[PDB]
Design a protein around this ligand. Structure first.
Ligand SMILES: *[C@@H]1O[C@H](CO)[C@@H](O[C@@H]2O[C@H](CO)[C@@H](O[C@@H]3O[C@H](CO[C@H]4O[C@H](CO[C@H]5O[C@H](CO)[C@@H](O)[C@H](O)[C@@H]5O[C@H]5O[C@H](CO)[C@@H](O)[C@H](O)[C@@H]5O)[C@@H](O)[C@H](O[C@@H]5O[C@H](CO)[C@@H](O)[C@H](O)[C@@H]5O)[C@@H]4O)[C@@H](O)[C@H](O[C@@H]4O[C@H](CO)[C@@H](O)[C@H](O)[C@@H]4O)[C@@H]3O)[C@H](O)[C@H]2NC(C)=O)[C@H](O)[C@H]1NC(C)=O
Ligand SMILES: *[C@@H]1O[C@H](CO)[C@@H](O[C@@H]2O[C@H](CO)[C@@H](O[C@@H]3O[C@H](CO[C@@H]4O[C@H](CO)[C@@H](O)[C@H](O)[C@@H]4O)[C@@H](O)[C@H](O[C@H]4O[C@H](CO)[C@@H](O)[C@H](O)[C@@H]4O)[C@@H]3O)[C@H](O)[C@H]2NC(C)=O)[C@H](O)[C@H]1NC(C)=O
Ligand SMILES: *[C@@H]1O[C@H](CO)[C@@H](O[C@@H]2O[C@H](CO)[C@@H](O[C@@H]3O[C@H](CO[C@H]4O[C@H](CO)[C@@H](O)[C@H](O)[C@@H]4O)[C@@H](O)[C@H](O[C@H]4O[C@H](CO)[C@@H](O)[C@H](O)[C@@H]4O)[C@@H]3O)[C@H](O)[C@H]2NC(C)=O)[C@H](O)[C@H]1NC(C)=O
Lengths: 218, 213, 218, 211
């Protein structure tokens, strides 16, 4: 028996990027042309890429040609597949199989395969923010809490740029959900809380989302 | 460039049946075909490394043929082990292409789905998530369609389906579909229904419930 | 300017695996020793891997030695870093750095750096499920419902194996949360809903989180 | 090889001449380099071979030392020079780094003004509660925020973010967000934020009662 061991596969977002790799055991890849194959949710096998012995010639299936790059390491026995700007239909199990035979030739089938690794390309390429008020309970503090937006960045202004003094817009934090969240605050005179209107202008160019939120006492 | 025209897309049979499958190249190749088995979610296994040319260690029940354009695979009395997918491959020096695999499956008469709908448990709902489940308990063949409607509004994009492979005692398929909604959105509507079509049904089947009733 | 661009960042789980890569422009990599570096939580740097010219030598810091693997592929100008068995202290920005000078020598600093890509190793190495009843409405269907776990499997049985006829447990689905869900069901005579108490004895075997739930009419 | 760098934070005025020291656990000859790093940016090389200034690096940066003691001197701090800095031992096919030094603008100690914000009704109706504690205009940068719900120390359910030094008053500000589902937030009443800082003789707590 001989073995191949795919790694790196998981959840992805459309127009995002991932890299797969395949290790091996009981054999050396330095003799073999190495191939990537996938099984789509529709159940059919698609060939994806190959790279020759001696790393000479690299070839691709026409759905991934130009978008993907195949790579190899003949010494530690690893193969790689960069997947730049993935499509929703790049969702598949991705297998790494060796072109091979007991005696090798200038043309053979795939005589050993690894168990395959799942890749899912979720269709949400950009997510637009939610915006929530940070309500002011001398000097008072108020703000806006931008949340659940992808990718960065978000820009925030206050009163269309007329209110700049005392404003702090914080660096975003990356949540364990894979989505970003930032807060923008401003300190102002407590006396102005009844008359002055405070509006934070949240712009998210990647989703083409604009939100104007008025922040007022509860 | 070559495309493989494998036929049928699904073959129905049973233990001890001799079966034949056929891959037809869209333009001629020099007998560069090979054939694989694939069990669900597994790696494929190579059976035949050139047309009619069986790989060593492969069970003797397997066979095939090739004519430079038309090709076959054949199994000499199926075992319960053989009820998996089969794929043809055309392999060139630095590329390959495969047939849309012939799924081999255990045959029976057509059977319509028993449909059941489950509301979210109160215990799930208090946590803030509502998962509504639709069960097609047993049917044959595999191909069925389920759609969700909330307040008679056809839903789109908020459900995930999985099918169990053939049952060990009756060889039917079964499907379940999970409609996912936050507690907020779920309490916004009353009726939650699933509508089913299948080979055995003369009209769509709908199961529904009213939230809170 | 010299151009470097990392790819393959994002979220990972403790005990999990990832692969980074970096590609380049305005130079060929083959004349350079290439490196990986990270910025650990204290704002301090750590060096992570170095691969020499012609892949002759590969050296690593003790924290990542035997866990990680660097590789390079000069014929397409790419460098890779596999990260098997990631741990929470590997949470950092990562960068692909060129060892170099205006005139290259036998030992040099790192001159050209890519903009970096973030890697986060979340401590959720075995996230335990949430388990919920599917309540029966001549034949009735009941069941149990599993959500939000990693890794697989979650395992289910009915009344500790006393019930087996008509039992189905479905293949898991990968949610947009990056966590699994499934369901288990059984069909029984409707007359027994009053007398027989159906229960599902479950386990998330990775975390060994053993759960039970009684399923009865609502 | 192992390295140490001191001080971990260096506070100075514009125009000052400052020195940052690196000490190696064993002799490394002159095989050491220095790097400037801005927030959110990859490090830029300043000096190598201990003293060799990189082509295009301003002359105000210099380095000296051999064996186990190395120094980076910046002679006349400009606003661009207030950054992270790191000593780096380099060898034919490897390297290692010290812990780094952060250079900041010095000002008097300023205690944070603390504010706590409960979740908005809108967000709360969606099923998620994000309270936000704000530490406004403090100096120096080290501050500690602890969340307590019904006097229960929270752990693992909050994230923090800190601004860079304010261009006008040289202070920092910090926001901490404690995130909880609607199911977990309604369980407990009081939500507090305990702040400690060099400018506070005892910790300051801001709190609210749910509802
Ligand atoms: C004078 O004559 C000599 C020959 O006598 C000429 O030299 C030859 O020049 C050819 C044309 O430039 C080159 O052919 C091209 O090569 C590339 C890469 O080929 C790699 O694979 C070769 C085969 O190795 C296989 O097969 C053998 C058995 O035959 C096995 O032992 C081996 O383990 C390996 O098996 C694996 O791969 C198979 C598929 O390849 C699988 O079927 C197996 O199961 C297994 O997985 C190998 O020998 C080559 O060796 C290297 O060659 C490099 C130079 O090319 C050299 O740098 C290096 O040091 C090695 O020596 C390679 O590793 C193919 O991809 C090309 O394919 C064509 O590409 C076209 C597009 O570009 C396309 O249109 C067309 O359809 C084809 O796909 C092509 O075959 C020869 O490699 C080269 N040979 C040597 C020894 O140098 C010389 O050029 C000529 N000069 C003049 C002026 O006339
Ligand atoms: C005939 O056969 C002889 C012996 O087999 C060959 O001599 C060897 O040649 C190779 C290639 O020229 C030498 O490797 C390179 O040596 C460079 C200089 O020598 C080193 O100096 C340092 C001190 O500065 C010493 O510490 C070393 O021990 C060596 O003496 C060296 O700079 C170079 O570095 C490599 O890696 C760096 C990484 O960045 C690259 O930048 C650099 O370009 C290069 O790739 C190599 O190590 C080898 O040292 C020679 N051996 C000796 C001394 O005999 C002849 O070259 C052969 N001639 C023919 C006809 O091919
Ligand atoms: C003449 O032709 C022969 C083959 O016919 C070449 O021999 C091969 O040479 C390579 C490169 O030196 C060898 O690859 C090395 O293998 C090491 C492990 O070898 C043992 O274990 C393996 C299984 O793991 C067995 O197959 C093998 O027989 C040994 O028992 C690896 O650890 C090496 O990796 C290290 O070195 C490289 C480069 O320095 C680094 O990039 C790596 O990170 C790592 O540090 C290396 O991959 C190969 O094993 C040899 N094959 C055989 C059959 O012996 C000759 O090299 C060639 N002559 C010349 C001068 O090129």
């Amino acid at each position: 028996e001989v073995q191949l061991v795919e790694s790196g596969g998981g959840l992805v977002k459309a127009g995002g990027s991932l890299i797969l790799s395949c290790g091996v055991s009981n054999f050396r890849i330095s003799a073999h042309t190495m191939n990537w194959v996938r099984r789509v949710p529709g159940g059919g096998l698609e060939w994806v890429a190959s790279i020759s012995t001696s790393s000479t010639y690299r070839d691709y299936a026409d759905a991934v040609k130009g978008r993907f790059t195949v790579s190899r390491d003949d010494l530690e026995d690893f193969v790689y597949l960069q997947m730049h700007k993935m499509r929703v239909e790049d969702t598949a199990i991705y297998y790494c199989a060796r072109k091979g035979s007991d005696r090798l030739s200038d043309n053979d089938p795939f005589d050993a395969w690894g168990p395959g690794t799942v890749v899912t390309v979720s269709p949400a390429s950009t997510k637009g923010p939610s915006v929530f008020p940070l309500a002011p309970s001398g000097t008072a503090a108020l703000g806006c809490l931008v949340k659940d937006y992808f990718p960065e960045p978000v820009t925030v202004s206050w009163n269309s740029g007329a209110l700049t003094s005392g404003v702090h817009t914080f660096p975003a934090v990356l949540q364990s959900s894979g989505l970003y969240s930032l807060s923008s605050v401003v300190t102002v005179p407590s006396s102005s809380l009844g008359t002055q209107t405070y509006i934070c202008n949240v712009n998210h160019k990647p989703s083409n989302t604009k939100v104007d939120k008025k922040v007022e006492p509860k | 460039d070559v495309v493989m025209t494998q036929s049928p897309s699904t073959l129905s049979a049973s233990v001890g049946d001799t079966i034949t499958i056929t891959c037809r190249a869209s333009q001629s190749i020099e007998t560069w075909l090979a054939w694989y088995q694939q069990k669900p979610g597994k790696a494929p296994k190579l059976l035949i490394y050139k047309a009619s040319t069986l790989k060593t260690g492969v069970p003797s029940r397997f066979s095939g043929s090739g004519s430079g354009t038309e090709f076959t695979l054949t199994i000499s009395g199926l075992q319960f082990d053989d009820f998996a997918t089969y794929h043809c491959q055309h392999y060139a020096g630095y590329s390959a292409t495969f047939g849309q695999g012939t799924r081999v499956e255990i045959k029976r008469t057509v059977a319509a789905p028993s449909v059941f709908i489950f509301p979210p448990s109160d215990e799930q709902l208090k946590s803030g998530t509502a998962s509504v489940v639709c069960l097609l308990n047993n049917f044959y063949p595999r191909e069925a369609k389920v759609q969700w409607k909330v307040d008679n509004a056809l839903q789109s994009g908020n459900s995930q389906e999985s099918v169990t492979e053939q049952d060990s005692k009756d060889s039917t398929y079964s499907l379940s579909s999970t409609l996912t909604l936050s507690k907020a959105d779920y309490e916004k509507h009353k009726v939650y229904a699933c509508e089913v079509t299948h080979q055995g049904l003369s009209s769509p089947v709908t199961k529904s419930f009213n939230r809170g009733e």
